Amino acid sequence: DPWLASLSLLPTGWVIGVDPDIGGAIAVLSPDGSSQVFDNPFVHIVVSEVIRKRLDTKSIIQLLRGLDAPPGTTAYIEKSSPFPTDGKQGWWSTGFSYGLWIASLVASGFSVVPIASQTWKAYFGLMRSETPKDDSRQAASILFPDKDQSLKLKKHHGRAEALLLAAYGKGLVLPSGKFS
Amino acid sequence: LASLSLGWVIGVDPDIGGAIAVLSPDGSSQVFDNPFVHIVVSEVIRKRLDTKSIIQLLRGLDAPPGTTAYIEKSSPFPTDGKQGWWSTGFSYGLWIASLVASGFSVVPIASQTWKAYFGLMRSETPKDDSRQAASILFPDKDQSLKLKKHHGRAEALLLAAYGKGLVL
């Protein structure tokens, strides 16, 4: 698989998960069971007389260089899937975000593995619900309870997806119920 | 631009079929085609840039850290479709992050800005004319610019020429 082999400097207990969109996050899981999650750094920019948000390339790379996760850690990234109602600039921007993140991760020595959103959601049973965004924050808070206050707002949906992608990569199991 | 930085000049044409040029203080020039891999979409093979190979290439360049890399300011092409807009931004972000992560400063330059600097703004055959302009500025590249497919090498060289301040 030439595409997957191009996503790591290395041939093909830390895990990284990245939701690469504006509004996304990066989660880092340590072998000792602790977790960290960071909002994706962005700037406001004017394109064709419209103010928009764009990922901050330098800040992403500086964040990555501050992590304690060593090279050779696998970074699971959600496979890009722009929305239909997005225009010209939005499809460009989603691709830009994806390329920024992939190159940044590879240059830090991480092995990038793209995962379709349907794949990691099905792994956690995050299907068939009218409230998928709320459910992803609930799921992440069950798996990473010390993040419960960092996931309590609707806008923390991106932190939740990043943690769940990392949980997927680590093979963590979400229990059937409160007392399971 | 501030988010794009941590006698040498780099110029980059970021697309598939693009290239990266390096100009050294001693007048010499190098140009390298963009490495790519094949991915399968539906039952058809498409090309994507090769991230691992790009990073290895940048790390092996003679230019020292802090060298500025000039690149055409990327915009979605109006007549492209959605997949093309995505691909344009993807290739651009891959290159921007690779350059920044490898210690270079990126300076995006508007298309009409660098083309006007070489009199290419009022050009009806821009690919052919860029190869001719590049071959005049870098005569030791004349043999690497003589095919139609070499217009990516030419853009990379002309962006670096713009950044170094060479005159046609």
Side-chain angles (χ1 to χ4, degrees), chain A, chain B residues 1-42 44-121 123 125-168:
Chain A
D1 183 6
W3 170 243
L4 187 45
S6 73
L7 297 193
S8 182
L9 287 171
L10 296 154
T12 56
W14 293 83
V15 180
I16 285 171
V18 174
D19 189 332
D21 196 27
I22 303 279
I26 169 168
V28 179
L29 306 185
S30 161
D32 74 355
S34 65
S35 57
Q36 303 163 274
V37 66
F38 309 86
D39 299 306
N40 284 356
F42 70 92
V43 296
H44 283 98
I45 188 191
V46 173
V47 183
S48 205
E49 306 188 346
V50 182
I51 186 168
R52 298 184 43 100
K53 304 186 190 177
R54 191 170 288 181
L55 286 183
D56 182 336
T57 305
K58 163 201 68 63
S59 286
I60 280 170
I61 288 159
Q62 290 164 339
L63 187 171
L64 288 181
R65 283 175 187 200
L67 296 181
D68 288 330
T73 303
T74 306
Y76 297 87
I77 189 171
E78 186 171 272
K79 202 177 299 188
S80 191
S81 195
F83 275 24
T85 206
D86 225 352
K88 216 172 49 194
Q89 203 48 43
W91 278 72
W92 185 93
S93 189
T94 292
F96 178 80
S97 295
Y98 198 57
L100 225 61
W101 262 116
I102 283 187
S104 289
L105 293 158
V106 173
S108 289
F110 306 131
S111 299
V112 181
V113 176
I115 306 289
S117 65
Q118 295 93 340
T119 295
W120 69 259
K121 281 178 186 154
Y123 174 78
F124 294 112
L126 290 166
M127 320 158 279
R128 291 180 193 99
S129 172
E130 300 172 341
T131 58
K133 297 183 172 190
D134 290 347
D135 294 1
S136 82
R137 291 187 299 111
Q138 177 202 13
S141 69
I142 293 162
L143 285 170
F144 307 103
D146 81 343
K147 299 293 177 284
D148 47 19
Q149 288 300 287
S150 301
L151 301 163
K152 70 178 183 184
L153 301 182
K154 299 269 211 180
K155 61 154 155 162
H156 297 151
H157 169 229
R159 302 170 172 183
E161 296 234 317
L163 285 157
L164 289 165
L165 275 145
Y168 170 89
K170 197 156 174 175
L172 299 179
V173 285
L174 183 62
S176 148
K178 198 180 171 193
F179 312 110
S180 291
Chain B
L1 193 32
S3 80
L4 315 176
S5 193
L6 295 169
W8 293 87
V9 59
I10 292 169
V12 171
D13 173 348
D15 281 307
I16 308 288
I20 174 161
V22 192
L23 310 181
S24 38
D26 63 21
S28 81
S29 64
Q30 308 297 341
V31 64
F32 310 96
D33 298 319
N34 285 357
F36 59 87
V37 293
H38 296 90
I39 194 183
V40 172
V41 310
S42 307
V44 77
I45 74 160
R46 297 208 143 152
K47 295 181 182 53
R48 270 184 190 175
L49 292 174
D50 178 350
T51 305
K52 162 198 224 176
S53 296
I54 282 168
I55 281 146
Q56 283 177 333
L57 175 62
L58 290 173
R59 285 179 183 175
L61 295 185
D62 302 329
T67 298
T68 306
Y70 294 81
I71 188 173
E72 179 177 300
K73 189 193 89 235
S74 186
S75 303
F77 197 60
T79 64
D80 273 3
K82 284 172 168 177
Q83 284 73 26
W85 299 334
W86 188 93
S87 299
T88 295
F90 177 72
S91 291
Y92 188 68
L94 216 57
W95 264 110
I96 295 279
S98 294
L99 293 157
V100 174
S102 299
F104 304 121
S105 322
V106 180
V107 171
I109 299 297
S111 178
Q112 65 276 3
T113 300
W114 74 261
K115 291 185 181 197
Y117 180 84
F118 297 117
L120 296 182
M121 251 303 293
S123 162
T125 56
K127 288 175 192 181
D128 292 340
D129 291 349
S130 63
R131 293 189 292 111
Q132 186 179 133
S135 78
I136 289 146
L137 290 160
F138 307 98
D140 64 355
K141 296 300 177 286
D142 193 291
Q143 302 304 317
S144 306
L145 296 171
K146 60 184 183 187
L147 296 183
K148 282 177 151 320
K149 63 172 88 165
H150 293 155
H151 68 259
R153 303 173 173 181
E155 178 174 314
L157 284 165
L158 293 171
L159 263 301
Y162 177 82
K164 199 159 188 171
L166 313 192
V167 185
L168 198 36

